[PDB]
From a paper:
S100 proteins are a subfamily of EF-hand calcium-binding proteins found primarily in vertebrate animals. S100 proteins are comprised of two EF-hand helix-loop-helix Ca2+-binding motifs. They are distinguished from other EF-hand proteins by a unique, noncanonical S100-specific Ca2+ binding loop in the N-terminal EF-hand, an intrinsic dimeric architecture, and the binding of Zn2+ and other transition metals at the dimer interface. S100A7 functions in the protection of the skin and mucous membranes and is a biomarker in inflammatory skin disease. The binding of Zn2+ has been shown to be a central factor in the antimicrobial activity of S100A7; sequestration of Zn2+ by S100A7 starves invading pathogens of this essential metal, a mechanism termed nutritional immunity.
Based on this observation and careful analysis of secondary structure predictions, a construct truncating the protein at His100 (mouse S100A7 tailless [mS100A7ΔC]) was prepared and used for subsequent crystallization trials. Crystallization trials performed on mS100A7ΔC yielded diffracting crystals in the presence of Ca2+, and the structure could be refined to 1.69 Å resolution. The crystal was orthorhombic, in space group P212121, and contained one homodimer per asymmetric unit. The structure of mS100A7 revealed the canonical S100 protein dimeric architecture; each protomer is organized into two EF-hands with the hydrophobic core integrated across the dimer interface. Like all Ca2+-loaded full-length S100 proteins, mS100A7 occupies an open conformation with HIII shifted out from the core exposing a hydrophobic cleft. The Ca2+ ion is coordinated in a canonical pentagonal bipyramidal geometry by the backbone carbonyl oxygen atoms of Ala21, Glu24, Asp26, and Thr29, plus the critical, highly conserved bidentate carboxylate of Glu34 and a structural water molecule stabilized by an H-bond to Thr29 Oγ1. The Ca2+ ion is coordinated by side chain oxygen atoms of Asp66, Asn68, and Asp70, plus the backbone carbonyl oxygen of Gln72, the critical, highly conserved bidentate Glu77, and a water molecule stabilized by a bifurcated H-bond with Asp70 Oδ and Cys74 SH. The two symmetrically disposed canonical Zn2+ binding sites at the dimer interface, composed of the side chains of His18 and Glu28 from one chain and His 90 and His94 from the other, are all visible in the structure. Nevertheless, the overall geometry of these sites is set up for tetrahedral coordination, and in fact, a Na+ ion is found in both sites. The most significant difference between the two protein structures is due to mS100A7 having a standard N-terminal S100-specific Ca2+-binding loop (Ala21-Glu34), whereas this loop in hS100A7 is truncated to 12 residues (Tyr19-Ser30).
Numbering used by the authors:
A (entry chain B): 3 to 95
B (entry chain A): 2 to 99
The structure:
């Protein structure tokens, strides 16, 4: 695999690792998303301070397009887009 | 150090920037830059059926180029990254099944 292929599989592995903990094994609850972010993107999460929990709930509701209170793989793309853009702003600054 | 996922995000960003720097705007992809990015970076994706054919790469570029300026900026590239991650998600499932 190329380094980018290794990167895509790492992201997919990540999603499944957290989604499998509770409820539907293919979807993230808010708590599964919270664990995924705190463990996987700490540089980003560390920057948010007091309003971290407010940010995670806003991100989750924005991603949960069908309002069923869980993130499927397709809805997770929304979160990946936000993470990629945040790390992009870091890649520069 | 950075987590595996953080390393993954930086790899994706680095890849975009490497190809976008070749010609024209150094922060956007020409069709020729996108084509090289895909064939070099995601060969398993490009191996699928007809994705190596001009038709597929030209239609993916057209779909991604939302403002019709004949280049893919970083925000438009997220469209392509979503398509790639969804295809590699099927490959992840086929590998688990084998
Ligand atoms: Ca779950
Ligand atoms: Ca949902
Ligand atoms: Ca360019
Ligand atoms: Ca464009
Ligand atoms: Na899956
Ligand atoms: Na950039």
């Amino acid at each position: 695999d190329t380094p980018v292929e290794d990167s895509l599989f790492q992201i997919i592995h990540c999603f499944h690792h957290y989604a499998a903990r509770e409820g539907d094994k293919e979807t993230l609850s808010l708590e599964e998303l919270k664990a995924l972010l705190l463990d996987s993107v700490p540089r980003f999460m560390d920057t948010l301070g007091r309003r971290q929990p407010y940010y995670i709930t806003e991100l989750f509701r924005a991603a949960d397009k069908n309002k069923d209170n869980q993130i499927c793989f397709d809805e997770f793309l929304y979160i990946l887009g936000k993470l990629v853009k945040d790390y992009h702003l870091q890649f520069h600054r």
